[PDB]
Design a protein around this nucleic acid. Sequence first.
DNA 1: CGGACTAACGGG
DNA 2: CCCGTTAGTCCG
Length: 232
Amino acid sequence: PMHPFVKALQEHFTAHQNPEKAEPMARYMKNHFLFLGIQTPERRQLLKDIIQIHTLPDQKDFQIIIRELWDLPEREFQAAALDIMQKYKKHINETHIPFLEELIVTKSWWDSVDSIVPTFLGDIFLKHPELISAYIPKWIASDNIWLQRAAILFQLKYKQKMDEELLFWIIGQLHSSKEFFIQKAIGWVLREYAKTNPDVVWEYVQNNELAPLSKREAIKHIKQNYGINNEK
DNA sequence: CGGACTAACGGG
DNA sequence: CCCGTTAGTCCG
């Protein structure tokens, strides 16, 4: 039996569906998912409505509610699940890594994976850096582009706390990937980290092989700092 | 390739 | 208001 909070959310979202918007929204995600057609501002309000009426469920039900929402067809339910997980943030710890892994590799796409990785997993590994090597090597070795992207992006927001040796090691392992979502994640994490340490990122990109997309994205801004040499 | 543009979302 | 970003399409 579906949890009453999830049932209430399903009814309320469905009552406000927009088939006209659902079409372009589904196309944007390359038709991997059905959509109700509800964009983020309204989707968060509809969740708010249900929390106001029912109250947020006891923490004992947290993982259950996330999984039930994950199993519903329309993409807005996974987006809502992530909003709900943020509400239970203070209950999440290192013991939830496998739970988060399973979310990464089910109903997988860039929208859900990017919402799980730099935030929830990033925070966990900042608190428990000793656990990185229990997961990152397996992720990289896996057949799964989303675990590979997770390995790249978990340090995205680390700024001065970035483990540079680790970042570059991870990138080195994945630099030959022909997968767009890997090449782009490499570009993104380098571009972001260059905001903290431009010299290190510039040196890396000039001295290590990267896919063209990865390099181009990495230096999107810092090419202004260093210049674009004449090629002849 | 890589630049220009679109549309939505996060946050100064 | 602005800017920076996951994507996305389109054009030499």
